[PDB]
Amino acid sequence: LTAAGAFSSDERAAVYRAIETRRDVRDEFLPEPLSEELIARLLGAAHQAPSVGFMQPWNFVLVRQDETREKVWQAFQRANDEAAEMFSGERQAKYRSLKLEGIRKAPLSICVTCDRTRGGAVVLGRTHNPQMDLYSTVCAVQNLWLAARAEGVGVGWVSIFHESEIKAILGIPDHVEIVAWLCLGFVDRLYQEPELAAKGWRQRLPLEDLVFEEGWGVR
Amino acid sequence: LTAAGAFSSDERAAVYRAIETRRDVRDEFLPEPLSEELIARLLGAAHQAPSVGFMQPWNFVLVRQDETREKVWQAFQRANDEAAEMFSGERQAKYRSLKLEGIRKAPLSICVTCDRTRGGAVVLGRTHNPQMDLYSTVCAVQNLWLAARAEGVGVGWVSIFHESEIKAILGIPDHVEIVAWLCLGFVDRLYQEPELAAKGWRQRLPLEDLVFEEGWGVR
Numbered sequence A, B: 001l002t003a004a005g006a007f008s009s010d011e012r013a014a015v016y017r018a019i020e021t022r023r024d025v026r027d028e029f030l031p032e033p034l035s036e037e038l039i040a041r042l043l044g045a046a047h048q049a050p051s052v053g054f055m056q057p058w059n060f061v062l063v064r065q066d067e068t069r070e071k072v073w074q075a076f077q078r079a080n081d082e083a084a085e086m087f088s089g090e091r092q093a094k095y096r097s098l099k100l101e102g103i104r105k106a107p108l109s110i111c112v113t114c115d116r117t118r119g120g121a122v123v124l125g126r127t128h129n130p131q132m133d134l135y136s137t138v139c140a141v142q143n144l145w146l147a148a149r150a151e152g153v154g155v156g157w158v159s160i161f162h163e164s165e166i167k168a169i170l171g172i173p174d175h176v177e178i179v180a181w182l183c184l185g186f187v188d189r190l191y192q193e194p195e196l197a198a199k200g201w202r203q204r205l206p207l208e209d210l211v212f213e214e215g216w217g218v219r
Ligand SMILES: Cc1cc2nc3c(=O)[nH]c(=O)nc-3n(C[C@H](O)[C@H](O)[C@H](O)COP(=O)(O)O)c2cc1C
Pocket: A022, A023, A024, A025, A026, A099, A100, A101, A157, A158, A159, A160, A193, A194, A195, A196, B048, B049, B050, B051, B052, B053, B054, B125, B132, B133, B135, B136, B139
């Protein structure tokens, strides 16, 4: 190991700037393809996330064809109407007004998966909670989401669809599970607070109400 | 919604630095207490994470007492004994020589939970994959891991336990699930590559092997 400590004031500020201004983007994606170099940078950041037992359970399928985007978007529509019919009155009306994906518009999409069987028979750290491998994959997603913002690339996670329909589109095996579908593209503008808060779907919870001391429920 | 774009060369480098140099720390934690302000910043960061339907399913149980850390440590050991047992001969010995937690060393520990029933009867984006709320919570963890790195603070995830045991020690309800136990403390030395690689457990996988173009298995 080598010497380490806190970043400089400017370095820490750049770190919190990405964490604080990254948004989940749906409708602001610009049409320019992301350079090959920029993509390698984004995947690299993801590849450096931590992973249980250093399993590195992830795979990334790059999707850049209209044909594929169309099939995925339709799978979204089928699922989204279904989700829509799970609400009523004004909350349903409000649900149908939200943009929940940017699939056909984002010049790039990425389906991040988790190979449940990588790492051999037994994987360190996943001996007691088997979901840790999936969680590892999410860490890879956030690292990319954060790297993306710094590059001025908007990223949007889309989870509205029946998994099996997507695995069919991409040919993903049974031992591999989809963790996320991500829409990517440059942006020249972002919301300053979560879009769902601005559109009145749900507001930011008071952090002070979610922190306990020693025991659950104890402030 | 306002104008936005890529970070400056220096800001981008800072974000990538945290991403590339952060590690899972187990045995280098320092006894020095973290200030309440430093803890607010780390928690603030996590709370800036994305969350399905803006669910914000997380809660953070700060642990700072010797007695709690002792009970939690015993839990770890039992779990870890039965885990080591799952490896044979050569590998088992290697497993046993690894340090997989700094529960007793870390001056601060944080149990990050996910309330499966928050957000109402139905929660946006979580109508097809009921796991999206846990995934959201992992995003919170990764933001805290990254901010912590910039603060010169180390973070170590420990998942080798029998969850039911930890829930009982912290008095966590049935509708709430533990996503992660994070050990925290200042750190002045960090491995230059994942500790498990340096110790011969698993090497870094070749990213080129995990990226596909358009469909699974296609280069
Ligand atoms: C696991 C997960 C799944 C998500 N799925 C969707 C989705 O399907 N459609 C969508 O518009 N947003 C989706 N989101 C984004 C949240 O709605 C978003 O985090 C929040 O409303 C805005 O957060 P932000 O302003 O930090 O981006 C998802 C987020 C997470 C963490």
